[PDB]
Design a protein around this ligand. Structure first.
Ligand SMILES: Cc1ncc(C)c(N)n1
Length: 167
């Protein structure tokens, strides 16, 4: 049994809710919240911008030190950093950004990072300002992630379309 409330069950392991990942993280304090990161961990907008704002910029400070030591992530890659006031850990995952011309096949690689964590609160990778089709992102999630994932979807309109169209 876990703390997550109000989710619709899509599959054995994938659950979805119309929610603000920030407000959901603040309520649940999950072991892992996933950030929709870029390779530079520059958390300027969308999921990354909102999560970072909720940490009072502590996520960005920590991220800048990570990049100065390790250099950029790979598209499709991830790193584990602090969850600050939102979660125990933040899994920063880089989905491909279609608005930069990145290969959408890297979306599966991105979701494979979730399998290293038994339970996660996450957004749909490569959705929103990353430019991918969220319907496609949800399909790749369901077909890739085997651990228990609780998806928070920002738009009520998009949420209803994801549920109605789910196979
Ligand atoms: C799931 C989600 N996507 C985007 C934003 C900004 C947010 N707060 N939550």
């Amino acid at each position: 049994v876990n703390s997550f409330s109000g989710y619709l069950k899509l599959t054995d392991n994938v659950y979805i809710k119309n929610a603000d990942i920030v407000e959901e993280a603040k309520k649940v304090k999950p072991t892992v919240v996933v950030n929709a990161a870029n390779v530079y961990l520059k958390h300027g907008g969308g999921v990354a911008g909102a999560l970072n704002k909720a940490t009072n910029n502590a996520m960005q400070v920590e991220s800048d030190d990570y990049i100065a030591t390790n250099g950029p992530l790979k598209v499709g890659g991830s790193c584990v950093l602090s969850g600050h006031n939102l979660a125990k850990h933040c899994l920063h995952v880089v989905g491909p950004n279609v608005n930069k011309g990145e290969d959408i096949q890297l979306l599966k690689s991105a979701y494979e990072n979730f399998n290293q964590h038994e339970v996660l609160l996450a957004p749909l990778l490569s959705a929103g300002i990353f430019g991918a089709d969220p319907i496609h992102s949800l399909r790749v999630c369901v077909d890739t992630v085997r651990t228990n994932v609780y998806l928070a979807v920002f738009d009520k309109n998009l949420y209803d379309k994801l549920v109605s169209s789910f196979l």
